[PDB]
Amino acid sequence: PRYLGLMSGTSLDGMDIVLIEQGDRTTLLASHYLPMPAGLREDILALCVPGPDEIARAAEVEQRWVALAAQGVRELLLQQQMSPDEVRAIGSHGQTIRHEPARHFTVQIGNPALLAELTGIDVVADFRRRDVAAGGQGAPLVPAFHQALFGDDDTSRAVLNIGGFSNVSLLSPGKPVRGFDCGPGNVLMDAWIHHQRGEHFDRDGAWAASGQVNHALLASLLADEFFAARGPKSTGRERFNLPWLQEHLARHPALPAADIQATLLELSARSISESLLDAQPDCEEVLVCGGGAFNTALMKRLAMLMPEARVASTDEYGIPPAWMEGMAFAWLAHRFLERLPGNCPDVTGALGPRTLGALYPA
Amino acid sequence: PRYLGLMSGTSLDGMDIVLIEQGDRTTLLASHYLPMPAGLREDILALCVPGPDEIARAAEVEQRWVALAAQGVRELLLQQQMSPDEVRAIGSHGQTIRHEPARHFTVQIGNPALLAELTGIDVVADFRRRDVAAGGQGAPLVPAFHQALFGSRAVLNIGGFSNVSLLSPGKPVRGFDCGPGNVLMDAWIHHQRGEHFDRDGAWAASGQVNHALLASLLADEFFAARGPKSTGRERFNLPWLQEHLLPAADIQATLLELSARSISESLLDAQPDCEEVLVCGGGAFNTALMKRLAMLMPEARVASTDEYGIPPAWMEGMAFAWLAHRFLERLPGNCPDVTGALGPRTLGALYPA
Ligand SMILES: CC(=O)N[C@H]1[C@@H]2OC[C@@H](O2)[C@@H](O)[C@@H]1O[C@H](C)C(=O)O
Ligand SMILES: CC(=O)N[C@H]1[C@@H]2OC[C@@H](O2)[C@@H](O)[C@@H]1O[C@H](C)C(=O)O
């Protein structure tokens, strides 16, 4: 059947919407991006830290988020010349405003009942909670999907997402799927260039490529306890943010802004490489998705730090890097409806396999 | 099949758990009450007003609430000698910590995914949101169930808050919240005398109704409104009463009359031809209130629901088990003429075990 996937990630630039065909395999039929207004982005970010009157504030933010998603679903279907009735379900991640696996909770907002009401399509949502409920991290959730797409018993491969945050799926033949967050992907580089130069992202990693890696700063950033931990682990804005970076910066004389940028690129390269190679030293292929796949300087640094492996963007495997996550969530809606597991216990640390999500019928 | 119903209401004394048999009709098979600890009750109440760090605080409260519910489900099933596999689903209301239909939102907590994980049973939950999403009040939700059981008569719940279902032959089901049931009388006696409720309405029966206070309390805009309407702790609370504010027992007597009058006047305004009023909730055993309801509605027979085969205390739990059955059968759970929603809607969300 046909499934919609709805993802809104860490960057908060806008919503990813995806149409997939799901039978024996997964086929991307269509994709649609809708920018998020500055107001909504800032209001979401304000909910990402503890604050006053959060229940009402989140309820009102969630309305606008859902109205925008429904709008985006309408636009995709019209542009593809198909009616809501031709889609079996929308797999909606919602929007993470808090991720505290160590306190046994994770918060994705996005009122799925309103989403079903506005789209007239069945909604499967809230995928992370049942994994956390089973003792797991609730993240990353793509591994099972990466496994469905790229699982091959000839070669050991890692499927790496570089978004705001980085995460990897380790597909070792004959062994259970493993994986975890590696740490910051684009989140720090975006925040640094936005703070200094007013731009949302560092195009092709060019500002970073114009500076010099500072070894002292790099070592102290890699000293964060998160990078040392192994096995199931997940992270978010709670750990890696701009105040976090500036605390490491305030201990030492003012450094050139482009050099801080260069260092942050290397932090992402090194934290990915070291955590990946620690878990799958026999890695032969690294398949890269998310925005980071088109960061030239990062894709080059990843190639230098993992010489034993072929580092390549996921587009030369038939899957556009930007749409992988949306597709995963459409696929999770299919998995829910078929009563098939969505998590990987050796990824999240959950007690066992679980059916993820909840069903809100149209 | 068999369904569990899980309700935790306004009073926050504890959780109602219900087992029903559902085929052509609804049969109560078993019921189980589990008290809520003082800590959890107070922590829930703290979330019923705006405050700091609510996301994390609610996540942690919800975890204790679910753990207690799972514990109560385990206890019921053991005591009834049946395994989790014999139950098709749990209908869980969760716990209302905010109800703002005018701002198009209502907040019931109670992590249904954790509930399915701990019980090993499928969970249907979050019943109010789809109705609010369709333009409705999201409350009251019992009317459709009251209609399935008792379908001219009014079916009246007196809990912390009062609500009525008006079952007029040949006409669509109507209904609304009438206002405070026991909530204010409980709050007043707990504030003055330290007791959780006014046993049989005896403290109230010992005082004199104050006409002046009564009139000013009935002057609240909510009592004047008609058609679909819902309320909660946001409107009727102890600071609300004290703003309008005499001997303490006289205030109690007045509060009993407020409940009697607001129920009577709103009921009779909507269904003047009412012949039978079937009363559920704790208020059904408040003697002085059940007498005052009989005085104010002479045209109607006012009777507790137990003499219709349904114990007053378990009606709500049964409604929510029934709503789980309705979800799974893809049948509507709201009444558009009750809630004001745009049309009939399948209520709730399914969290498979
Ligand atoms: C709590 C949360 O939303 N985590 C995100 C984040 O974004 C990337 C990474 O960190 C991953 O763990 C997850 O998202 C992707 C879609 C996932 O679950 O696979
Ligand atoms: C928002 C909310 O939880 N309302 C409750 C409350 O308690 C009684 C009454 O006011 C009713 O409107 C509702 O619960 C019952 C179970 C209902 O929806 O029918």
Side-chain angles (χ1 to χ4, degrees), chain A residues 10 93 96 99 128 139-142 161 165 167 181 325 329:
Chain A
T10 306
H93 166 74
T96 296
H99 186 59
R128 302 191 187 279
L141 282 192
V142 292
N161 168 243
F165 293 93
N167 53 278
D181 292 348
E325 287 185 345
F329 280 96

Side-chain angles (χ1 to χ4, degrees), chain B residues 7-10 93 95-101 106-108 128 137-143 146 157-163 165 176-177 179 229-232 234 316-317 319-320:
Chain B
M7 184 60 205
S8 192
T10 308
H93 166 79
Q95 182 78 61
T96 296
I97 57 172
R98 215 72 55 84
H99 186 60
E100 304 279 0
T106 187
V107 187
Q108 288 68 237
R128 306 194 184 274
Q137 291 295 115
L141 280 192
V142 290
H146 287 169
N157 169 250
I158 312 172
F161 292 93
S162 287
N163 51 279
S165 309
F176 42 85
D177 295 350
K229 62 172 182 186
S230 68
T231 194
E234 297 89 356
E316 286 185 345
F320 282 103

Side-chain angles (χ1 to χ4, degrees), chain A residues 16-24 26-59 61-73 75-174 176-246 248-281 283 285-299 301-312:
Chain A
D16 298 313
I17 310 170
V18 134
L19 183 74
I20 68 161
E21 173 63 49
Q22 183 69 39
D24 331 84
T26 310
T27 311
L28 182 60
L29 287 176
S31 57
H32 184 57
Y33 170 85
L34 187 51
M36 185 164 285
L40 191 52
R41 172 188 187 288
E42 296 308 327
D43 288 346
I44 294 163
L45 284 179
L47 290 160
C48 288
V49 293
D53 190 41
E54 282 170 337
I55 297 301
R57 285 167 56 217
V61 163
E62 167 166 66
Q63 258 254 49
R64 285 191 273 150
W65 186 97
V66 175
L68 190 71
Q71 174 184 324
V73 162
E75 298 168 354
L76 182 157
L77 295 172
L78 288 182
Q79 283 167 19
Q80 295 298 306
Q81 298 183 255
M82 49 186 283
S83 92
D85 318 311
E86 296 177 45
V87 186
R88 199 184 170 195
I90 305 172
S92 178
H93 166 74
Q95 181 78 61
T96 296
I97 57 169
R98 215 71 56 84
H99 186 59
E100 304 279 357
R103 298 167 67 183
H104 314 278
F105 75 85
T106 187
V107 188
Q108 289 63 236
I109 63 172
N111 193 350
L114 186 59
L115 185 60
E117 177 68 30
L118 303 176
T119 60
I121 304 166
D122 286 4
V123 175
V124 187
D126 209 35
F127 295 95
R128 302 191 187 279
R129 288 185 100 188
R130 181 64 192 278
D131 185 83
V132 180
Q137 290 296 121
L141 282 192
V142 292
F145 181 59
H146 290 169
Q147 166 62 27
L149 294 183
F150 298 123
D152 185 26
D153 30 78
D154 290 36
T155 152
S156 56
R157 58 187 18 168
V159 185
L160 165 78
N161 168 243
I162 313 175
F165 293 93
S166 282
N167 53 278
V168 70
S169 308
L170 306 145
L171 321 181
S172 291
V177 182
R178 292 168 296 143
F180 43 85
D181 292 348
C182 308
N186 298 127
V187 74
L188 299 177
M189 290 191 284
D190 287 357
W192 190 244
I193 196 171
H194 186 67
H195 168 72
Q196 293 285 356
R197 299 181 58 192
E199 283 166 333
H200 285 107
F201 60 102
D202 180 18
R203 245 281 241 115
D204 290 291
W207 195 42
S210 81
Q212 302 301 316
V213 173
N214 183 281
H215 293 249
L217 184 66
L218 179 64
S220 66
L221 294 171
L222 285 160
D224 190 286
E225 307 153 25
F226 177 84
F227 298 122
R230 306 201 305 154
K233 61 172 182 189
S234 69
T235 190
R237 334 192 83 116
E238 296 90 351
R239 182 158 243 120
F240 306 104
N241 48 65
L242 199 58
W244 176 83
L245 168 67
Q246 274 156 348
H248 288 86
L249 290 176
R251 304 159 181 183
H252 314 290
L255 221 56
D259 289 354
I260 295 164
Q261 191 76 358
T263 307
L264 295 172
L265 184 144
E266 199 62 28
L267 174 72
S268 294
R270 287 269 290 269
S271 57
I272 289 167
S273 294
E274 295 169 16
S275 78
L276 199 154
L277 289 181
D278 170 277
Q280 204 188 57
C283 187
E285 286 182 32
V286 177
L287 315 207
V288 186
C289 45
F294 296 110
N295 187 319
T296 302
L298 182 58
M299 290 294 282
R301 280 309 288 157
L302 285 170
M304 295 307 167
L305 291 162
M306 296 182 286
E308 188 166 291
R310 189 185 190 275
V311 185

Side-chain angles (χ1 to χ4, degrees), chain B residues 62 105 114 137 144 179 184 205 246 288:
Chain B
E62 165 168 65
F105 77 82
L114 183 61
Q137 291 295 115
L184 296 176
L246 224 62

